[PDB]
Amino acid sequence: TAKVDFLKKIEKEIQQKWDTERVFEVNASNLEKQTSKGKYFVTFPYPYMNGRLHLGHTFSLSKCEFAVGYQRLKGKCCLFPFGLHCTGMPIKACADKLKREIELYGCPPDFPYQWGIMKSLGLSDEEIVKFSEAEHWLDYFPPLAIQDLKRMGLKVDWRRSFITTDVNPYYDSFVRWQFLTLRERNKIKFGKRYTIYSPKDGQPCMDHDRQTGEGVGPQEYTLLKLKVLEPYPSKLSGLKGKNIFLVAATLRPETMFGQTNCWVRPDMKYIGFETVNGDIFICTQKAARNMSYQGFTKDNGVVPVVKELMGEEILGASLSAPLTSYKVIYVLPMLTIKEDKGTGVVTSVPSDSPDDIAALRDLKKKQALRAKYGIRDDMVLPFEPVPVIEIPGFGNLSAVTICDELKIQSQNDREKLAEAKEKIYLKGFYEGIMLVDGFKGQKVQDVKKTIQKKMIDAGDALIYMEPEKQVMSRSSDECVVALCDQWYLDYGEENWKKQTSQCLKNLETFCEETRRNFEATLGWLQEHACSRTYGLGTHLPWDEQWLIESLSDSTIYMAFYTVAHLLQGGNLHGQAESPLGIRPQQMTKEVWDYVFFKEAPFPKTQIAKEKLDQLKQEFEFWYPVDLRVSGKDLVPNHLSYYLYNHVAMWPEQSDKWPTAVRANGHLLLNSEKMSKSTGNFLTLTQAIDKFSADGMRLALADAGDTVEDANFVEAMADAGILRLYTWVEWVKEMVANWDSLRSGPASTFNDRVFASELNAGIIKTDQNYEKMMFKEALKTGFFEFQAAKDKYRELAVEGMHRELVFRFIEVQTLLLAPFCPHLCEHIWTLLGKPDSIMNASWPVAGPVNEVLIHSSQYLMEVTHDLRLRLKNYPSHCTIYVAKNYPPWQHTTLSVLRKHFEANNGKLPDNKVIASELGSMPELKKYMKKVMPFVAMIKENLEKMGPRILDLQLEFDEKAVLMENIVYLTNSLELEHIEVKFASEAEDKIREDCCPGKPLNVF
Ligand SMILES: CC(C)C[C@H](N)C(=O)NS(=O)(=O)OC[C@H]1O[C@@H](n2cnc3c(N)ncnc32)[C@H](O)[C@@H]1O
Ligand SMILES: CC(C)C[C@H](N)C(=O)O
């Protein structure tokens, strides 16, 4: 317990040191004069401030944190800036939701939550009243997140942090210049388009202000109009005189030539309302909402309800359907009707829809179902399936044949209906052929749109856009697809999309699945609505009313990082003075152009040339973005617009486009989802309070480095705390007893073994750090490192050589630095080292000899087997080692060598090997042992390479054994071990013992 407290004390002291020394503040004015090794620009997409920062954000930023901790030791000058996102509606949604139940009820509010979560954060009762305005959120949460980050100890130049709404005037001017240049180059466009839309919010709902289906778009439906013919059913008598239409949703208009009736749900509530032209549409509630927002009614979003009813009161109504062969069809019931899709009204195409003919047969069999709703004989019997589309494998009546073949007798046969619908699902999309006149012998793929247009021009069909899946907004409002006018980014331009495809070709994605997602979201993208009305951010500069959504004012902000320290200089809101003395309003479009475009002319500005040149130098030095780390959730939306805007703003300078992007999965805590509902959740401050942020970073580096979800194990973090405490106390012990170690030459066998192991570990760690596999880098550089250390301590009977010990300590403190830099800086100061550890470089690795590491692993295996066999049955041990392989083993290994040499290293199957070795007489007595032997061989062939195929070992087995017999006798608690050369041994040993696998008897 006190170990974590000691760690936190060290962290706070070293953070005070890092702040007072200002070691992480980098400036292009100083670093461009010393061309050290090149720049390294990492970026973390700023998170939203609608709450404290949790462990997922920390895991996502740990990637670039460790990356800069590694690259700064390799000589590259690192830039890790960090912004803070406050654009967007979520803040406002939560706050006004709070006001809703704060003023319609009391304080505390009476029930039968949100205020509960706020008090769970622990604010004072008289302080949540101050949370009505978002101004207090932006004055409160950015400082707290910054404090949490500084307590974590990130290598950030904090003078470059800022806020993203109009509260910050400098970022506001930056966004204004961005959008002015974008609309200047025809990248923005005003127009009336379809989009997901939140009625309660009154604006298009994009991916970052939703609550379900974070990538759902609109989906098109052909909406057929069916004239309700007289005699009107009873419940409609009040609306006599006007036109009454049943609106039915479909995606297969070409099948409407074979309509027989109209399926409705008898126990669902339908609503009939008035359209814009005075007619009456009958649909469901949400269908009416969607239609109203798609300009179907007189007023946008207004549904004048003229009658509410049930499906039972609708059955038997005569209908005039479009394109049907029957001049009169009827309204029939259907019980298997989903209450979410479409209008609650489906078409009856029994020739190519299986559920339709199923229901038709259920009605046609008995008087029970046919009379079950007043459906007289005339509404079921004469309605036969109408052959309209011929699928070659089934005939003119496809669904009929496939259902009669799969032996289905229940419209409610969900398994069999699913089967039958799957069988001809797509074979009617291509292989289907029209049969009606005008289209006799047409590919249905080439006529469905023309038939849709034919119905629309006839005034019998319309377009209905619906959310492909149910979408909830930030305001708990069910989104609908609305046709609204807005300013949108035309991400569908051919030239722009092709240029971004070239950028993706040049972009470095760390896996192929990331590039797959990028190509898919590039092919899927189209006009994207960037205009909002409710929320925060920056207004459109030419249209002061339209606000900019969070996913559009956050595309090229990384250029603002390069000058945030000289424009507002640390102050988040930009209210204070400018360190360069540049007024907030003084930044004009041409000023930004000169700062960010290379060939831009110096504009007419009262700003002196020195400051503009300094900003241009900063930008032209740090850019482009070398790396952007994020979770894979921002792949389809954020990083796509990121590359798009980087291509659009600099269409001539590909050298300034993003260099690389790294995607990680979402974080799991104790193998469980991080959710406030399950009690398995850790904010950054709680995680630091519990796991000594150094150690939290350690466990995060071990959490994972793949696209799959990483796992944060608390027990692993505690184990890391214990290991670090043992390491620190061991280093203290060594500092104490330096005078109690061996001096002189590092010439002992174990000294060489440990030194080569250390150098190999250095190499493995560097190679894992370049590839950003932080889990594997930790495995090679900390765990295996400590293992080699403890092995060398165990085997060094003549005392550990001080030079090797402290070279190891130095190298370990270096390799662990990017993970737990507080403890590493503490140890670096404990060594009496003059400067801070952030100035150190990469440790140079000496020569590596594979053969001595192989002999060390050999001794390890020998010790393991010795402790195994000591279990049963002493004082003396006797070991036997074979020079050459026994004749049968030598022959089998020669055969395996031939089979390896002949075919580029592919040993045949066990079958061929057993067959050919049964074809050798010299193995007749040993065919029982031959196949096991070979088997074992194969294992090691995949375990430690082909070196086991050599007819003789790379080292002296007997001398290697004899260089550590002392440790073996001391650990095995014996009295003597005689090593004999296996030829003096008896028959069994001399016959079965092979080189590399010695035997022994006590
Ligand atoms: C520039 C702008 C358009 C970005 C925008 N401000 C934004 O996305 N803000 S945010 O508050 O949710 O995302 C912050 C980052 O943290 C990662 N992350 C979030 N949650 C988790 C989690 N549970 N587990 C793992 N990672 C998580 C996520 O990928 C994201 O990159
Ligand atoms: C495509 C679906 C919405 C409708 C289907 N073709 C049917 O007749 O039931």
Swiss-Prot record:
An example GO CC term for this entry is: cytosol
A single Gene Ontology molecular function, please? glutamine-tRNA ligase activity
* Predominant place of localization: cytoplasm
The organism is: Homo sapiens
The motif 'KMSKS' region: which residues?
Answer: 673-677
- Activity regulation summary: 5-fluoro-1,3-dihydro-1-hydroxy-1,2-benzoxaborole inhibits LARS1 by forming a covalent adduct with the 3' adenosine of tRNA(Leu) at the editing site, thus locking the enzyme in an inactive conformation.
Q: What does this protein do?
A: Aminoacyl-tRNA synthetase that catalyzes the specific attachment of leucine to its cognate tRNA (tRNA(Leu)). It performs tRNA aminoacylation in a two-step reaction: Leu is initially activated by ATP to form a leucyl-adenylate (Leu-AMP) intermediate; then the leucyl moiety is transferred to the acceptor 3' end of the tRNA to yield leucyl-tRNA. To improve the fidelity of catalytic reactions, it is also able to hydrolyze misactivated aminoacyl-adenylate intermediates (pre-transfer editing) and mischarged aminoacyl-tRNAs (post-transfer editing).
> Which parts of the sequence bind L-leucine?
46, 48, 551, 554
Q: What is its EC number?
A: 6.1.1.4
> Which family is this sequence assigned to?
Belongs to the class-I aminoacyl-tRNA synthetase family.
Instruction: Please report, in chain numbering, the residue ranges of the motif 'HIGH' region.
Output: 54-57
Arranged from A to Z, the UniProt key words for this protein are: Acetylation, Aminoacyl-tRNA synthetase, ATP-binding, Cytoplasm, Disease variant, Ligase, Nucleotide-binding, Phosphoprotein, Protein biosynthesis
Q: Whom does it interact with, and what assembly results?
A: Part of the aminoacyl-tRNA synthetase multienzyme complex, also known as multisynthetase complex (MSC), that is composed of the aminoacyl-tRNA ligases for Arg (RARS1), Asp (DARS1), Gln (QARS1), Ile (IARS1), Leu (LARS1), Lys (KARS1), Met (MARS1) the bifunctional ligase for Glu and Pro (EPRS1) and the auxiliary subunits AIMP1/p43, AIMP2/p38 and EEF1E1/p18.
Encoding gene per record: LARS1
InterPro entries referenced in this protein's UniProt entry, alphabetically? aa-tRNA-synth_I_CS (IPR001412), aa-tRNA-synth_Ia (IPR002300), LARS1_ULD (IPR054509), Leu-tRNA-synth_Ia_arc/euk (IPR004493), M/V/L/I-tRNA-synth_anticd-bd (IPR013155), RBD_LARS1 (IPR055416), Rossmann-like_a/b/a_fold (IPR014729), tRNAsynth_Ia_anticodon-bd (IPR009080)
Annotated effect of mutating residue 204 to A: Reduced leucyl-tRNA ligase activity
Please quote what the entry notes about the protein's domains: The structure of cytoplasmic leucine-tRNA ligase includes four main functional domains: the Rossmann-fold aminoacylation domain, the editing domain known as connective peptide 1 (CP1), the anticodon binding domain for tRNA recognition, and the vertebrate C-terminal (VC) domain for tRNA binding.
Catalytically driven reaction(s): tRNA(Leu) + L-leucine + ATP = L-leucyl-tRNA(Leu) + AMP + diphosphate; L-methionyl-tRNA(Leu) + H2O = tRNA(Leu) + L-methionine + H(+)
| One biological process term in Gene Ontology | cellular response to amino acid starvation
Q: What effect on the protein does mutating residue 207 to E have, as reported in its record?
A: No effect on leucyl-tRNA ligase activity
Please give the name of this protein. Answer: Leucine--tRNA ligase, cytoplasmic
